[PDB]
Symmetry: D2
């Protein structure tokens, strides 16, 4: 096997190299993500949740990712720098995998998002008027700072901050929620991920996973893609969800 | 075929009877639901969602229910008294059916809930300390007036009032949410309805769909039963959801 | 001077007695508060905020209260048992005083509330329809588990759990907020404590500071009384507020 | 007397000219605000709440404003185009006035805000780390899209959208509230307007009343100014608050 180790800072990189060596895995080192990372049997990510998002932006077909958390909460990670060698060994020897859907949006065809597509005002302190359709039906029209279309994995990201519910990783769905909605009443809406979401807004910017973005006007379609994020199975993922969420900051 | 008409007040009951009779259906009227409603091919309810919740509490096997909304929002109803005739003919002719899961709790194993199981302080104005586990993991413990375990169908009821999300009727899940939580941070949690929910509390009551209740002390488990609620297919269910929610009051 | 020591459990009571005695203060111990507490120059309470709420319910004219926190957050307390001695000496020597207004409601004209008057359904799990007027204007009508009329001091209690704002203790106002409102939009309202509040509801109870309650049907008026709560000046009150709130649980 | 009539569109301007003439008032017409508007006995504003904000940005000492609402809610306005002639006549003949505090911020010395100062990320979809101090005490540190320091008049603006309480116009205070706070728990804080607010944020933009703005880094002080907004007394202002708020969109 050949693995890619992608790191932001090189604190623990030597020990990771030595672990993968003891495991008879060939190692290539990267300090920035690239599409070349598709050419590996697996990817070791050193950093945080954000680091995994940036790696994912470079992958269409996704080799399984093992995350070592130096970041903070690490909802996407499998180990810390203190316990990684035991966890990495178990992960590669078992080689069990887990998949989470990513979505696309029509304003950025070849971009994929694990957390959310967000549609925001191009100018801060400026509202946009957002119309929401789902499978062709008009669901809402609200003036707001922006509007989030998140997966369940994204329920703990921006959607969370906007007031959304925590949804467990293994319940596939969309969370549709506004940021600073200027209306007396509003609610987050949770719908099946097999549906097609349409957002219409003038003078907007669309943003996938806080990374790639483009200005747009009018209609954008968001739908589940065929290219999921792939991670080594983290067998305590559901258990760890609720403690991690309560630590968010 | 034979139908039961269940009403609270004598609404358009003679008219509805006449419509069934022109469809070659035999009718029997019920001022109150009973277990006798199982001995019918289908059930027409005249009332609001609350009437339908009371029909269901008397049914294990559920003949498909057609709801005529005399109440308020009528998320469980199919028509108005000003248009029932046409949807009713359409329904019995096609006889297309739709099912939503019900849950039961161990404190009252024989009673089924479509909306939610709620665990409240036995004395109003007193908090209770509620511990929540899901498939055996301690997910939270929180001081509160009560705690709601709802289905997606129940996301528009008591859970909605506690601050929960609107979940579409075809996405199967539990919403777990406190009533007046005395804590700085809290979120509703949305989890798979395949999971087992455990609630532990002292000096408490348990209520199913607002209808049946009993005092309890200690652990109760809530889980998905084998006896879903059966309605005629409402083809506009998802598209109707949005305007009905905004009308909530 | 003579002081009353009121406690729930025999905490640091012998120690506290000894400290008062070295300040040339005479002491009498109270296992339960009574109207007899008016015949003292000051009152030391050993307990939490709840103990202080119970002292106050027995006082019209209020000797200044010094609180030793054995409970939880102790927004109404002055010290811990691990530091009471020093703040207590400091307090009796300077004898600087601080007052917060109390309110009364017409259902129980003789009982005063520092935190809030709460109007709840008499039966748990049942909503009540609450109409709210302020100086005679109909401000709202809403179906809910209950409705809270709090002072700024009460903004960190039941009102906080219902979703209310944190108001500093020196900004005099009412917070008006429902418990589990069954409606698409709602807000808490903050108004001048000089205004008269009218609540109308049937099949209800009214509760003052969590302590005294009575059944009522119809209109009640809540207004500012002439008998404020009197504590020794806590010089860190405002700065302490913020960390205590975040610790709420 | 000499009045300035400031309008966005000229639909009803002729009738306003004729009304002021019948009242023996000299009229000057403006289709954009300017500092020259200080030179008048009163100002008639035709447009909405936003129109009043833009006028106010050009005034240090403020002549009394009478607002004719063609906008939407009109919390700041006195009449509609259907009833203005009766209301204008009563307003000028009585000449009773009402004042609401405006605040300044140190990053824009000569700018005044009626609603709020908002401190936002310069880049959309980017959080800033905001530290909040009040009278020198550290109150909070939160990662967020932005942070609002509103007056009570602003409680129905951006602060409202971020989740803040409705505060009546005659209760002077600050509302301190984050936009999209990335934290498990948070609350709006309501404090006395006699206090000094300090916000510290890197890579921010500060915005007064959605109008004037400047990029800044580090510490900004917000405090009540000596230059209030002055309006003709609207004797139904408190009464109208609650209906207007429920109509917000
Ligand atoms: N809440 C907000 O107001 C806000 C605003 C914009 C974006 N975001 C989130 O940040 C993501 C991209 O970030 P960016 O480059 O703009 O900033 P970023 O610095 O990469 O991320 C900001 C924070 O979000 C955390 N995070 C990322 N995914 C998460 C997940 N799904 N659950 C819980 N926390 C998660 C990050 O974790 P680590 O520290 O471990 O890397 C970090 O603490 C977006 O996908 C969006 O979900 C949040
Ligand atoms: N929100 C609260 O503070 C609160 C408190 C107790 C109970 N409830 C809800 O009321 C239900 C029945 O309890 P009850 O007998 O005490 O009250 P109820 O009077 O029988 O019904 C309460 C109200 O909720 C509506 N409703 C019922 N199911 C709904 C659904 N899932 N989505 C949206 N609205 C729904 C009813 O509609 P109709 O007018 O058409 O009948 C009625 O107006 C419970 O299952 C619970 O969901 C809510
Ligand atoms: N949040 C809810 O769901 C709910 C329900 C009922 C009552 N309450 C609150 O409890 C108070 C007393 O009622 P009770 O006898 O039923 O309960 P309690 O057990 O006497 O007190 C309830 C809890 O609230 C705390 N508390 C009291 N006043 C507070 C204040 N203004 N700010 C922050 N925390 C405060 C107490 O602190 P200590 O631990 O230090 O004593 C205690 O932990 C009421 O006035 C009401 O404010 C809240
Ligand atoms: N809620 C949000 O996400 C958001 C975002 C940015 C700014 N704002 C608010 O808008 C103000 C400046 O606006 P801008 O030029 O960016 O946009 P704007 O177009 O002038 O105003 C946006 C909306 O806010 C309304 N409004 C202004 N002051 C209000 C008040 N205090 N109470 C209730 N509604 C009020 C306006 O009323 P009319 O239609 O009558 O003119 C308009 O409907 C700011 O002071 C801020 O309060 C809100």
């Amino acid at each position: 096997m050949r693995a890619a180790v992608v790191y932001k800072t090189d604190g623990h990189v030597k020990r990771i190299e030595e672990a993968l060596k003891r495991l008879e895995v060939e190692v290539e080192l990267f300090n920035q993500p690239s599409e070349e990372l598709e050419n590996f049997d697996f990817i070791v990510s050193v950093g945080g949740d954000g680091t995994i998002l940036r790696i994912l932006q470079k992958l269409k077909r996704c080799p399984p990712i093992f995350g070592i958390n130096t970041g903070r909460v690490g909802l996407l990670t499998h180990a810390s720098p203190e316990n990684f060698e035991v966890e990495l060994k178990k992960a590669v020897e078992k080689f069990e995998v887990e998949r989470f859907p990513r979505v696309s949006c029509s304003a950025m065809p070849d971009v994929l998002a694990l957390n959310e597509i967000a549609v925001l005002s191009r100018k801060p302190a400026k509202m946009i008027d957002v119309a929401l359709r789902v499978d062709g039906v008009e669901v809402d029209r609200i003036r707001c700072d922006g509007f989030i279309v998140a997966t369940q994995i994204g329920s703990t990201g921006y959607a969370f901050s906007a007031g959304g519910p925590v949804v467990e990783p293994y319940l596939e769905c969309f969370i549709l929620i506004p940021i600073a909605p200027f209306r007396f009443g509003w609610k987050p809406y949770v719908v099946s991920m097999e549906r097609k979401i349409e957002v219409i807004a003038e003078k907007a910017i669309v943003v996938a996973d806080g990374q790639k973005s483009v200005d747009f006007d009018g209609e954008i379609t968001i739908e589940k893609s065929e290219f999921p994020a792939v991670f080594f199975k983290n067998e305590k993922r559901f258990r760890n969800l609720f403690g991690k969420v309560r630590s968010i900051g």
